[PDB]
Coordinates of C-alpha atoms in Angstrom, one line a residue:
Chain A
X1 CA 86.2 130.5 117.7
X2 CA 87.7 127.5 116.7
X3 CA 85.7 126.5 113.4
X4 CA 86.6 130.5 112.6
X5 CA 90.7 130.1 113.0
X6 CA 90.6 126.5 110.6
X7 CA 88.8 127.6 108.1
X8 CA 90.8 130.8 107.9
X9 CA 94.1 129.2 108.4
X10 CA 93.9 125.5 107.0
X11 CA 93.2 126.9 103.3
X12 CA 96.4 128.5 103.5
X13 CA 98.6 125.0 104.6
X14 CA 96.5 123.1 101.9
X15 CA 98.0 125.6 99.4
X16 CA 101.2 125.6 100.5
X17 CA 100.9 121.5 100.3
X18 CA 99.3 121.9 96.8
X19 CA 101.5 124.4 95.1
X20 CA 105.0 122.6 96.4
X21 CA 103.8 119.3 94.9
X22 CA 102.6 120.9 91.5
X23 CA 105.6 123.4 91.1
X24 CA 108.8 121.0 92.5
X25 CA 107.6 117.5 91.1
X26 CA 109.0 117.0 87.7
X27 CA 106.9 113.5 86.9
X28 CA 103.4 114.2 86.6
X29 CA 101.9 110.6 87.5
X30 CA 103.7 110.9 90.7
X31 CA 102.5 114.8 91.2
X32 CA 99.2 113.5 90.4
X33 CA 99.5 110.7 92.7
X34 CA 100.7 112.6 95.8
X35 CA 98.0 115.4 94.6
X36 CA 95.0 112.7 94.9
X37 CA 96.1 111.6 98.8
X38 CA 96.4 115.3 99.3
X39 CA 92.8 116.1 97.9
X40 CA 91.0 113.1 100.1
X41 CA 91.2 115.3 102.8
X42 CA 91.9 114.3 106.6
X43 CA 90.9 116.7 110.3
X44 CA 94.6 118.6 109.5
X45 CA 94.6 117.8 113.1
X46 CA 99.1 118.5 113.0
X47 CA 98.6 121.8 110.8
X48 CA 96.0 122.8 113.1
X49 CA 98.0 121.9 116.1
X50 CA 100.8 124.3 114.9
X51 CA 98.9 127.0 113.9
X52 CA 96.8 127.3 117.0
X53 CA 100.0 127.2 119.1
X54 CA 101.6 130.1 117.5
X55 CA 98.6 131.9 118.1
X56 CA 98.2 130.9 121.9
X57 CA 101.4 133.1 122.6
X58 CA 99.6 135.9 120.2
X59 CA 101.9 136.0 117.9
X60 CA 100.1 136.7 114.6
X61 CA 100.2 133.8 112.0
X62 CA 102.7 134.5 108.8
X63 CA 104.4 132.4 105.2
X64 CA 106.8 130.4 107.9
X65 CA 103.9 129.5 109.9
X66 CA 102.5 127.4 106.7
X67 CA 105.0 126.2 105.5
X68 CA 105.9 124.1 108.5
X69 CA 102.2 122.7 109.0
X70 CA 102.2 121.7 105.8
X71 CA 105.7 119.8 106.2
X72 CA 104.3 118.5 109.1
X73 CA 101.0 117.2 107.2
X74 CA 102.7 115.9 104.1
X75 CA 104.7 113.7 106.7
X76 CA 101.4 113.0 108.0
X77 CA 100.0 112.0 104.8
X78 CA 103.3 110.1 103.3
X79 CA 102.5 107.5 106.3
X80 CA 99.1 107.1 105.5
X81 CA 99.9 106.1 102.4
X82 CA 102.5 103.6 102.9
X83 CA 100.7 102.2 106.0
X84 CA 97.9 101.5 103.3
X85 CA 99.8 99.2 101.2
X86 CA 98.6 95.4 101.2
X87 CA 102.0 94.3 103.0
X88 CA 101.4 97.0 105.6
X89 CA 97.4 98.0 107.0
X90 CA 96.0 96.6 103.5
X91 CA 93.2 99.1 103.6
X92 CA 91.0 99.7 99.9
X93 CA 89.4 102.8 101.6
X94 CA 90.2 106.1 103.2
X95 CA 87.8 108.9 103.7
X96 CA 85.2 106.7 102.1
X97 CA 87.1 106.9 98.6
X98 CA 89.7 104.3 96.7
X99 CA 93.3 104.4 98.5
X100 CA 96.5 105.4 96.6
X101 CA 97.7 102.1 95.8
X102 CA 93.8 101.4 94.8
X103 CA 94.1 104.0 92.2
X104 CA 97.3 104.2 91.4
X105 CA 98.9 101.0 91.7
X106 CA 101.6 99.8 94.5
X107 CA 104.8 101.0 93.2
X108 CA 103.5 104.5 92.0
X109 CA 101.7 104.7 96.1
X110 CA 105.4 103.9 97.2
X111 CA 106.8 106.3 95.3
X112 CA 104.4 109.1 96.0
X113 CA 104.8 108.4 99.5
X114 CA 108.8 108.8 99.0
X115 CA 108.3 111.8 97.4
X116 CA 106.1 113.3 99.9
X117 CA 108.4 112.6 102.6
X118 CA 111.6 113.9 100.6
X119 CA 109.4 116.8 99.5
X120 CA 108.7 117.6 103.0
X121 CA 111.9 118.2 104.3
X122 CA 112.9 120.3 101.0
X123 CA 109.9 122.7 101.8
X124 CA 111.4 122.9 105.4
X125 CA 114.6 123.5 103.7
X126 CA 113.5 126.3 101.4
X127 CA 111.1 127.5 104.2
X128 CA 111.3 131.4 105.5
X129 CA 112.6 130.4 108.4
X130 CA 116.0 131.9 109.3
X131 CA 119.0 129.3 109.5
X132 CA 119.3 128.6 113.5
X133 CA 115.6 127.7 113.3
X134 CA 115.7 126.1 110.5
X135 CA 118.1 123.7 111.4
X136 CA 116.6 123.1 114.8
X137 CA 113.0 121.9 113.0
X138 CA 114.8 120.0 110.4
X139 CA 116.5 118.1 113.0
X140 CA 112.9 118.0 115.3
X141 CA 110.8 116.4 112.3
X142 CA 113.4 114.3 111.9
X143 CA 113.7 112.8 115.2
X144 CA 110.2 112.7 115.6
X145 CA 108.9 111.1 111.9
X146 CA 112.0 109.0 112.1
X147 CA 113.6 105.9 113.5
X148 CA 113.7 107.9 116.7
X149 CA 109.9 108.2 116.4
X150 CA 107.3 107.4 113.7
X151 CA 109.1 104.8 111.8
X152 CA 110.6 102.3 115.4
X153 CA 106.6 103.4 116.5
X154 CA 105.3 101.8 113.1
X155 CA 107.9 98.8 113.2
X156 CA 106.7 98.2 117.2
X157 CA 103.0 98.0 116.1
X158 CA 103.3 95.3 113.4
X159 CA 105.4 93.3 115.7
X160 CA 102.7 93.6 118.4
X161 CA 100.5 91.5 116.3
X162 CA 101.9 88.4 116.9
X163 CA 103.4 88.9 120.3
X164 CA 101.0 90.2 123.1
X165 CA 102.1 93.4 124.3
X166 CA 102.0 95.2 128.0
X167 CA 100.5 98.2 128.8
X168 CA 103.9 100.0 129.4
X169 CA 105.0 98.5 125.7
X170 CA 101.2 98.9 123.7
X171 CA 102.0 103.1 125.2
X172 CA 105.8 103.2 123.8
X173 CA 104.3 101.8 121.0
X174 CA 102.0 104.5 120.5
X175 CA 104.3 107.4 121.9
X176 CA 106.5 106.6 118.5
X177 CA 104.0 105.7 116.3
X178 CA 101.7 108.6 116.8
X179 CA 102.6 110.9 119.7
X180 CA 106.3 112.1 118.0
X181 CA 104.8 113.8 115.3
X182 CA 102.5 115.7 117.8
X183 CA 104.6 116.5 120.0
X184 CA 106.5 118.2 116.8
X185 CA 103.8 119.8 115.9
X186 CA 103.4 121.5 120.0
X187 CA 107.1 121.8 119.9
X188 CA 107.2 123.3 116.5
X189 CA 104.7 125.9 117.9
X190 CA 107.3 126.8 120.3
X191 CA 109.3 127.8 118.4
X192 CA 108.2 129.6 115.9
X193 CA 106.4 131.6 118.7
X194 CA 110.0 132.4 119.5
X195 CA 109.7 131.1 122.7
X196 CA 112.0 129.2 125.5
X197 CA 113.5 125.9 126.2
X198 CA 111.1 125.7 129.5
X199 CA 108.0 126.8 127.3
X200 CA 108.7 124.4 124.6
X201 CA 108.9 121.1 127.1
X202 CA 105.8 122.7 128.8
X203 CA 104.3 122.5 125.7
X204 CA 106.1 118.7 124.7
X205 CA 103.9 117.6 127.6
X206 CA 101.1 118.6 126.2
X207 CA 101.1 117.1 123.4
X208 CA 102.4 113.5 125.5
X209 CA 99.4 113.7 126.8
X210 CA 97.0 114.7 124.0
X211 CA 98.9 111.9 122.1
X212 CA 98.1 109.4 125.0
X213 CA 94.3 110.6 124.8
X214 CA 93.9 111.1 121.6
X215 CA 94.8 106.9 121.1
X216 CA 93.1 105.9 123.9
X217 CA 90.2 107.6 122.7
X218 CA 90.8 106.0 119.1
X219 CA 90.3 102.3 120.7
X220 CA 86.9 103.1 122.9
X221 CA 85.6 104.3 119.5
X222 CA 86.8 101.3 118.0
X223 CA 85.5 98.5 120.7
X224 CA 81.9 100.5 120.4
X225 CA 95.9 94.0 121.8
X226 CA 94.3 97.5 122.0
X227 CA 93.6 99.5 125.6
X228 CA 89.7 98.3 125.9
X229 CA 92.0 94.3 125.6
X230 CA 94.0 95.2 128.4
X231 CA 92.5 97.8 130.8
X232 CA 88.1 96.7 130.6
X233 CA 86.2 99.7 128.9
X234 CA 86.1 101.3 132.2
X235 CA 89.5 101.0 133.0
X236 CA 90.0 102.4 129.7
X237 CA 87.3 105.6 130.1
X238 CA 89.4 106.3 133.3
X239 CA 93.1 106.9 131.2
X240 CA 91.2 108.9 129.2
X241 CA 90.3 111.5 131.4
X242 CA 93.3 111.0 133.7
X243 CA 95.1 111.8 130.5
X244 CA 92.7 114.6 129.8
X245 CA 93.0 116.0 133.3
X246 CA 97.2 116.1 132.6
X247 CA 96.8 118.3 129.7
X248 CA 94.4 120.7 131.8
X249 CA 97.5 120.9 134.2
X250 CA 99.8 120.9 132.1
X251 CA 98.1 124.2 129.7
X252 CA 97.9 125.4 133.4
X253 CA 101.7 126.4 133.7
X254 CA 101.7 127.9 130.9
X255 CA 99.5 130.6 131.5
X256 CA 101.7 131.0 135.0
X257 CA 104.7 131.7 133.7
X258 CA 103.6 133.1 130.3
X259 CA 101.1 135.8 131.2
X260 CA 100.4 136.9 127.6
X261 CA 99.6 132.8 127.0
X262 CA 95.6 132.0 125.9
X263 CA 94.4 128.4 126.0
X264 CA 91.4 128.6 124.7
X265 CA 92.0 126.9 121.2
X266 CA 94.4 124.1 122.8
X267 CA 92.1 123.6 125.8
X268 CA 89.2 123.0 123.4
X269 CA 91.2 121.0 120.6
X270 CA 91.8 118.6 124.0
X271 CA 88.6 118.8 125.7
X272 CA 87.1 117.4 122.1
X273 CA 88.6 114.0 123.1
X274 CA 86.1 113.4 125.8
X275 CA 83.0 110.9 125.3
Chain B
X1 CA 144.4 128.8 103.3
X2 CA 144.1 124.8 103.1
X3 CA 146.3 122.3 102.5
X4 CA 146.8 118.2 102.5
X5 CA 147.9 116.0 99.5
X6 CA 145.9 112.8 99.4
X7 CA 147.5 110.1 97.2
X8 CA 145.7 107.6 94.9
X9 CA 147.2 104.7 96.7
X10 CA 144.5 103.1 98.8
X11 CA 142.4 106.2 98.9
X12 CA 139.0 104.4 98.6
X13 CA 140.0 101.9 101.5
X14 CA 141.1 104.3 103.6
X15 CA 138.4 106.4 103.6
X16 CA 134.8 104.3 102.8
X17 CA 135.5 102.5 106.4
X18 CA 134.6 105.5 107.8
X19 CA 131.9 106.5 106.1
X20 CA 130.5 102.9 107.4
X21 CA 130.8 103.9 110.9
X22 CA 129.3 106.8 110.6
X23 CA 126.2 105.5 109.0
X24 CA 126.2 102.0 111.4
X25 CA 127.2 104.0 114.3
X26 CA 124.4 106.3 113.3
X27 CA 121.6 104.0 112.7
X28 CA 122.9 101.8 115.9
X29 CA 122.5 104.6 118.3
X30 CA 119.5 106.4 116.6
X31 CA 117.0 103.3 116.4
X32 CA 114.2 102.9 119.2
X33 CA 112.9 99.5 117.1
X34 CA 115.7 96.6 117.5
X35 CA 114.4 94.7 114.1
X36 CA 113.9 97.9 111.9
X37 CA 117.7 98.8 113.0
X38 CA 118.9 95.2 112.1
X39 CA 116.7 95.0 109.0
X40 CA 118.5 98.5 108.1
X41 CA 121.8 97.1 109.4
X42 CA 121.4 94.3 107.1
X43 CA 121.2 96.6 103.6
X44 CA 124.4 98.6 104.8
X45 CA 126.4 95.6 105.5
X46 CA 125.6 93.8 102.5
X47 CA 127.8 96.0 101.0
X48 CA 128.0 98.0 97.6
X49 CA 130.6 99.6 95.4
X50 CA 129.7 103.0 97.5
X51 CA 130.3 105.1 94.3
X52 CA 128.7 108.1 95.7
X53 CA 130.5 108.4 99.4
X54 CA 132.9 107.8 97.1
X55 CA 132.8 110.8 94.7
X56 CA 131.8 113.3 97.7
X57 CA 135.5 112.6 98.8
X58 CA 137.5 112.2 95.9
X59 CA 136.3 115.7 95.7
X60 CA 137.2 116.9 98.8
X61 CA 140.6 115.0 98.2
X62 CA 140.9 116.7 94.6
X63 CA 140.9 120.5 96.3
X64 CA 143.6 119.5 98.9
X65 CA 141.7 119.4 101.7
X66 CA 142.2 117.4 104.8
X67 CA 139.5 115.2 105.7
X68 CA 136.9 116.2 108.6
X69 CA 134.1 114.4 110.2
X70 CA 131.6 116.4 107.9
X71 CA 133.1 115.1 104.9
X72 CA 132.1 111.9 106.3
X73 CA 128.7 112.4 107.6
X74 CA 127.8 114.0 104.4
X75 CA 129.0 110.9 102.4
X76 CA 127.4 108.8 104.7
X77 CA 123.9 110.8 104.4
X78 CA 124.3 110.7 100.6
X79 CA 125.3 106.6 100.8
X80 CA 121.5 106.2 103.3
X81 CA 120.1 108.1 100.6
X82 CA 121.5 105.2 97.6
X83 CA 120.5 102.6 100.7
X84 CA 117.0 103.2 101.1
X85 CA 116.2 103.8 97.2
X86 CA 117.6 99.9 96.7
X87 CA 115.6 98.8 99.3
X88 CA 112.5 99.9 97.8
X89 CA 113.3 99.5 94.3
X90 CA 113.9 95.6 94.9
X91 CA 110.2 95.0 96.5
X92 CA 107.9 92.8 94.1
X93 CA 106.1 96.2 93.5
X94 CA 108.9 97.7 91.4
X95 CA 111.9 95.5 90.4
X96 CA 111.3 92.5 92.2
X97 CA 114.5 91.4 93.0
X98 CA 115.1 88.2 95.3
X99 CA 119.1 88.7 95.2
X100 CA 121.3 91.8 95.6
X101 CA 124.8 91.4 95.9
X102 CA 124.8 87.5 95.7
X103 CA 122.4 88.0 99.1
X104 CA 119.0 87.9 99.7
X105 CA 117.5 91.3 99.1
X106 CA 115.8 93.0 102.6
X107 CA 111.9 92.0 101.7
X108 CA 113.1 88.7 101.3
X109 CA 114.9 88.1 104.5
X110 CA 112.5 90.3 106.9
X111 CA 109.3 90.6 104.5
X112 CA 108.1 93.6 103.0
X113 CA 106.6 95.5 105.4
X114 CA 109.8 95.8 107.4
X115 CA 111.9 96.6 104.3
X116 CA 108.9 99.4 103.6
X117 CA 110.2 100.6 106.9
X118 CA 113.6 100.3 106.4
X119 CA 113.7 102.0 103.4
X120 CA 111.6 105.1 105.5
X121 CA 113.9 105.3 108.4
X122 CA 116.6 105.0 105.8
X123 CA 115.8 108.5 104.2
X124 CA 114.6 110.0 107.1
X125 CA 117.8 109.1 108.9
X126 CA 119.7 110.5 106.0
X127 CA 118.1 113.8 106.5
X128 CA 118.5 113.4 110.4
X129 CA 122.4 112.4 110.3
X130 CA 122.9 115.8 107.7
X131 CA 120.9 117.8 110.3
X132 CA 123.4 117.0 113.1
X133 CA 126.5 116.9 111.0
X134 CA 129.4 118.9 112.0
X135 CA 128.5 121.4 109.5
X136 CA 128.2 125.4 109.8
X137 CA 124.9 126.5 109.8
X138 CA 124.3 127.9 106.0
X139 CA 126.5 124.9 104.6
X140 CA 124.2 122.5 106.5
X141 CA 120.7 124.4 105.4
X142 CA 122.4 124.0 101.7
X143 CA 123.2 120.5 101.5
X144 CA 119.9 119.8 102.9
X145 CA 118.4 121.8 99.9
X146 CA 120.2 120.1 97.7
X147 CA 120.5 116.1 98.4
X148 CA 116.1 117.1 99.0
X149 CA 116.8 118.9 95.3
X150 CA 118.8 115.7 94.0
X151 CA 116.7 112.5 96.1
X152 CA 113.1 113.7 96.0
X153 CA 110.5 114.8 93.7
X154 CA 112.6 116.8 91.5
X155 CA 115.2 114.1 90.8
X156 CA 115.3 110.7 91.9
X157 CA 111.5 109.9 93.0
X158 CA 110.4 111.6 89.7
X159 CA 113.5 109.3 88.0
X160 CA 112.2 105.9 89.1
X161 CA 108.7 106.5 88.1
X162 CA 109.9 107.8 85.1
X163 CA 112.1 104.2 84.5
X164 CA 108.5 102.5 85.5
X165 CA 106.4 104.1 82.7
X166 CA 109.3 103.3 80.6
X167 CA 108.6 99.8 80.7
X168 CA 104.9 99.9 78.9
X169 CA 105.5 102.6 76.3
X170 CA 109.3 102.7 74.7
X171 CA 111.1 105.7 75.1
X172 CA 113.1 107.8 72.9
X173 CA 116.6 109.1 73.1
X174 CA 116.1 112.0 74.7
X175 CA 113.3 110.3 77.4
X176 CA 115.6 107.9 77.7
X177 CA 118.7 110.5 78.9
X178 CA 116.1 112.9 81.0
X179 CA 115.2 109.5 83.0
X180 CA 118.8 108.4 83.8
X181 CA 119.5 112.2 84.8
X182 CA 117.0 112.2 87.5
X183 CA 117.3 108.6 88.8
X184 CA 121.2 108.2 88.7
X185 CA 122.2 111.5 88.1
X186 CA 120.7 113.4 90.1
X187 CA 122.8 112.1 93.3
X188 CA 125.8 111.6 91.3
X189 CA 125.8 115.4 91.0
X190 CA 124.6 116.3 94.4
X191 CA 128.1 113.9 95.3
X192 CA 130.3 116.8 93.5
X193 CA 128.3 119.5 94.6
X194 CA 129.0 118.7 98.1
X195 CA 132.7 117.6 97.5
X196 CA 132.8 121.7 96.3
X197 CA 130.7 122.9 99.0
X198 CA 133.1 120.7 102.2
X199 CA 135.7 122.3 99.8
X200 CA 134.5 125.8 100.0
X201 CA 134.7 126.8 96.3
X202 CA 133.0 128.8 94.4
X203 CA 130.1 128.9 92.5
X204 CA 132.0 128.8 89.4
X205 CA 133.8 125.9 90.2
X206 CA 130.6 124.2 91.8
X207 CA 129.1 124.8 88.3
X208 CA 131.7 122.9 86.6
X209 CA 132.0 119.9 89.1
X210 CA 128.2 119.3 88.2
X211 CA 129.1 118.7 84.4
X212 CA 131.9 116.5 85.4
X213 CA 129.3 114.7 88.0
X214 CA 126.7 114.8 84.6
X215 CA 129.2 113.4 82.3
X216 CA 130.3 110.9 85.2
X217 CA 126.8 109.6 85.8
X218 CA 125.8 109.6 82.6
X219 CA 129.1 107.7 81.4
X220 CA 128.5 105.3 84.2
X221 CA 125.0 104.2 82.6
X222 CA 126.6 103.6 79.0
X223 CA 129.8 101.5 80.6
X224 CA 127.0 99.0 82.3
X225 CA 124.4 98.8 79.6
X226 CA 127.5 97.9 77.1
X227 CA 128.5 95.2 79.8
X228 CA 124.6 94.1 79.6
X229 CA 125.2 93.1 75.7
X230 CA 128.7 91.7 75.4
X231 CA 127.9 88.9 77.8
X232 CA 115.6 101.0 75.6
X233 CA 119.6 100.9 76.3
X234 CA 122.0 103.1 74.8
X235 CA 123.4 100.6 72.5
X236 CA 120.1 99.1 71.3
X237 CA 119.4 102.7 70.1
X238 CA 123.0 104.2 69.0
X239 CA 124.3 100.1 67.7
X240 CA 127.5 98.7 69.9
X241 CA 130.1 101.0 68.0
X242 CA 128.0 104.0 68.6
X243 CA 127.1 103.4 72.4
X244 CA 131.2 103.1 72.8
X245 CA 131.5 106.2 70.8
X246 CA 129.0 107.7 73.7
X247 CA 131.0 106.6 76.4
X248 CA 134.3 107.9 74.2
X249 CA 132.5 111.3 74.3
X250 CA 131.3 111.3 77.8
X251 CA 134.9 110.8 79.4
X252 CA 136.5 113.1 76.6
X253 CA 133.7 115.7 78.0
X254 CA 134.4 114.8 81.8
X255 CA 138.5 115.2 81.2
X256 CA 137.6 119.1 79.3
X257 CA 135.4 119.6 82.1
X258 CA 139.0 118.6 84.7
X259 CA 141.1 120.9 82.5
X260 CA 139.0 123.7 83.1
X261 CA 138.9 123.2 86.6
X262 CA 142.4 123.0 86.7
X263 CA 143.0 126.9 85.4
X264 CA 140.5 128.4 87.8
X265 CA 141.8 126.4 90.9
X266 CA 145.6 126.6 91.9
X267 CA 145.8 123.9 94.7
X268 CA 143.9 121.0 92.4
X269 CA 144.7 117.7 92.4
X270 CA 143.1 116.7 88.9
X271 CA 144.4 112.6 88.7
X272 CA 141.6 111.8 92.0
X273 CA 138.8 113.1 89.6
X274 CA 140.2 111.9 86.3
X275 CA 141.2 108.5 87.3
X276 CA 137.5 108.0 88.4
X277 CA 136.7 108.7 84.6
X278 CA 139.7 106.5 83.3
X279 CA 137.9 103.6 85.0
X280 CA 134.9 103.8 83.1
X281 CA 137.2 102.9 79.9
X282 CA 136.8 99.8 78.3
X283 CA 139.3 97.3 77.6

């Protein structure tokens, strides 16, 4: 069961997240700062994306396991905070309570979002991952939460409201802004399941298209320049489960050429984005 | 063993060019967005003293060692690092700055939300260039630790909102030193740190080219808040005469530091590391 495996395993990123801030931050305003965006709480949806990967190969979850979902989801939450800022989304509320800059003021929310990006690559770094590893995630979350990824996808989105974009260039959009960092999280999976360079862009697909999906789905929550502008509601439904039908295949190849592969967490965490 | 003598002559100019291609060649070929690469193009070409590229190899060039393409990425990750924190710290938020440089600061050319961004890719991209350096695999997990160690939570982030509270409720002596340690020192002595490392010494020597990078950094800071009140600073709290004696101290420190350097370490060219100091003198 799904609700079984998170509420097992997401205690144990949310302490690695917790104890990194409070034991490697030497100013307590900004550990108390990063500590509050951290405590208003979020789906863990990257964590759990991780975890449940390493699992689907059966290998059983251990400290290196963690520590990478919770790398991955103070990247996660570092965005969310600068994204907040009046110059940026300009939002007062998240998870029905006041924003970090709300709270804490702009330059301190800037700040803690600095350090919570910073502090997720020296976790990474001090991680119990041996070195060949190591290096090869360091250099994965940095593609992917980087100007190769997060940051052009971020840059791409502002600009897109003043220009109107295509349906090719709204996707690339959303492939940086939002799909990198869960493709990292599938590809991240990989390899900490020890697993090969055909598995891991098996599993990259995967996560292309629950990316896709997952901000497709976003929009038709949001309309009940976006998908719903483009493609009509229908046109829009359809994507959906064309992307949802990809990811079926997709988890399908897997299980042929790994025969010790389970879907069942991934296949649910995917199916969830239906209406 | 290794061996290359670098002389003094032209040592900055003929190295810092490089250190600028790496990071422009870097941030041209590693950007998806055209106007967040431009927008981080601009900051880099706006230019700077580029103190701590610099330092990294000075260092290098102090233990004899010829000059690789790692030296160059890892001053060049360390210089994004410096890049980015500018970036941000000029934003109306923090120091509010409409001019760096004689130029217009990068919020006020592309607006802030870009230079939010910049500043992002900027340390990401620092982490990103180190991660693909040409560095052996335990060096590379290392410097990572470190310039994380010296940039994030533990030094510089902690530094700068440390300097912020500063500004409401006056700080002593000793606040006053622990804030400039973590927001200029703290990459000042991950600089010599990873001159030693590129330089494979040991962790003797490492040790001692952090109190030379300590007495650098914190030299540095006296040298520029006695230029502040000739024309909370050290010579509002020591007097003027007692802020020079600091600086005195600090370079008398940083040369000790040199000398013992000097008889642990056979091939060492002390004048690229001491000459750095003798330019903090005043005149």
């Amino acid at each position: 069961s799904l609700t079984n495996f998170s509420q097992q395993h997401l205690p144990l990123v949310e302490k690695v997240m917790v104890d990194f801030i409070a034991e490697y931050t030497e100013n307590e305003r900004l550990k108390e700062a990063m500590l509050y965006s951290i405590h208003a709480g979020g789906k863990r949806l990257r964590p759990l994306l991780v975890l449940t990967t390493v699992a689907a190969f059966q290998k059983e979850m251990e400290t290196q396991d963690y520590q990478v979902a919770a790398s991955l989801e103070m990247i996660h939450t570092y965005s969310l905070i600068h994204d907040d800022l009046p110059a940026m989304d300009d939002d007062d509320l998240r998870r029905g309570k006041p924003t970090n800059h709300k709270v804490f003021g702009e330059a301190t929310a800037i700040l803690a979002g600095d350090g919570l990006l910073t502090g997720a690559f020296q976790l990474l770094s001090l991680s119990q991952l041996g070195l060949s590893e190591k290096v090869l995630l360091m250099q994965q979350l940095a593609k992917a939460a980087g100007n190769q990824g997060m940051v052009s996808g971020q840059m791409g989105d502002i600009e897109g409201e003043k220009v109107s974009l295509t349906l090719e260039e709204l996707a690339a959009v959303h492939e940086k802004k939002t799909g990198a960092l869960i493709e990292f999280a599938l590809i991240a999976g990989g390899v900490l399941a020890n697993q090969t360079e055909e598995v891991i862009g098996l599993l990259t697909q995967f996560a292309h298209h629950y990316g896709l999906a997952f901000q497709i789905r976003d929009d038709l929550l949001d309309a009940t320049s976006t998908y719903p502008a483009l493609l009509g509601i229908a046109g829009a439904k359809d994507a959906l489960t064309h992307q949802l039908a990809e990811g079926s295949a997709v988890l399908e190849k897997i299980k042929a050429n790994v025969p010790n592969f389970s879907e069942e967490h991934l296949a649910n965490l995917l199916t969830q984005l239906q209406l």
